[PDB]
Amino acid sequence: STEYKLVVVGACGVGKSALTIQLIQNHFVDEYDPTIEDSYRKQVVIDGETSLLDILDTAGQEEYSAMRDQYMRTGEGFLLVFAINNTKSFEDIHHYREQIKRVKDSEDVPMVLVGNKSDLPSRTVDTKQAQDLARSYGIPFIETSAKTRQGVDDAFYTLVREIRKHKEK
Numbered sequence: 011s012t013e014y015k016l017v018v019v020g021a022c023g024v025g026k027s028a029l030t031i032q033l034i035q036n037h038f039v040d041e042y043d044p045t046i047e048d049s050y051r052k053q054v055v056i057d058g059e060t061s062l063l064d065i066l067d068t069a070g071q072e073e074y075s076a077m078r079d080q081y082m083r084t085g086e087g088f089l090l091v092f093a094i095n096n097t098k099s100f101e102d103i104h105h106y107r108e109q110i111k112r113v114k115d116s117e118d119v120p121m122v123l124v125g126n127k128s129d130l131p132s133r134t135v136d137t138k139q140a141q142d143l144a145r146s147y148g149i150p151f152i153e154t155s156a157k158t159r160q161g162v163d164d165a166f167y168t169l170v171r172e173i174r175k176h177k178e179k
């Protein structure tokens with residue numbers, strides 16, 4: 011019934027594709043084409059409501075595009091994905107939030123901070139500083155792992171609930 015247009019952003023290799031494939035198809039991919047930038051549909055039930063999730067898995071190159079601007083303009087919620095073992099990807103989160111705020115012309119955009127690869131032991135980004143950033147953005151923070159599926163459902167579902175609150179707001 012209700013359609014939700016989600017967009018997954020984040021640096022290369024943080025697990026954007028792997029997180030999306032786990033949600034849609036329930037399996038962890040060891041490798042996925044890092045150039046494929048396409049959207050995926052899936053019908054789910056969230057808080058007792060049939061929701062049609064339309065999830066754009068961003069990839070491609072590091073270039074600006076008026077077409078990519080339309081992607082964020084069409085999107086209703088955004089997953090800010092970084093890898094807990096890649097400090098560079100965590101620093102990139104600011105850039106991705108800035109580019110989304112640039113398009114939608116608003117600081118009130120449904121977003122969720124996603125710390126991926128929580129199964130890995132080589133942690134370089136503290137949970138506290140990830141919570142501190144999400145607090146500063148005023149958005150939820152969820153630690154996920156596309157390998158064990160831990161936190162994957164909670165990541166996308168929280169974004170859907172953020173969109174619902176934004177609609178009432």
Ligand SMILES: CCC(=O)N1CCN(c2ncnc3cc(-c4c(C)ccc5[nH]ncc45)c(Cl)cc23)CC1
Pocket residue numbers: 019020021022023044045068069070071072073074075076078079082106109110113
């Ligand atoms: C495997 C390689 C990989 O996963 N990539 C994914 C991230 N890509 C990006 N890198 C740097 N900045 C990027 C900026 C944008 C962007 C955003 C977030 C919002 C509006 C926009 N309008 N035009 C571009 C844009 C996007 Cl969609 C991707 C970026 C590199 C390849």
Ligand SMILES: Nc1nc2c(ncn2[C@@H]2O[C@H](COP(=O)(O)OP(=O)(O)O)[C@@H](O)[C@H]2O)c(=O)[nH]1
Pocket residue numbers: 020021022023024025026027028029039040041042043044069126127128129130154155156157158
């Ligand atoms: N251990 C672990 N590895 C992951 C996880 N998510 C993704 N990966 C690995 O990270 C690599 C790149 O993931 P990918 O989905 O292509 O990231 P993307 O470029 O942002 O789309 C892949 O080889 C995956 O096996 C995770 O939650 N845990």
Ligand SMILES: [Mg+2]
Pocket residue numbers: 026027028042043044045046067068069
């Ligand atoms: Mg990918």
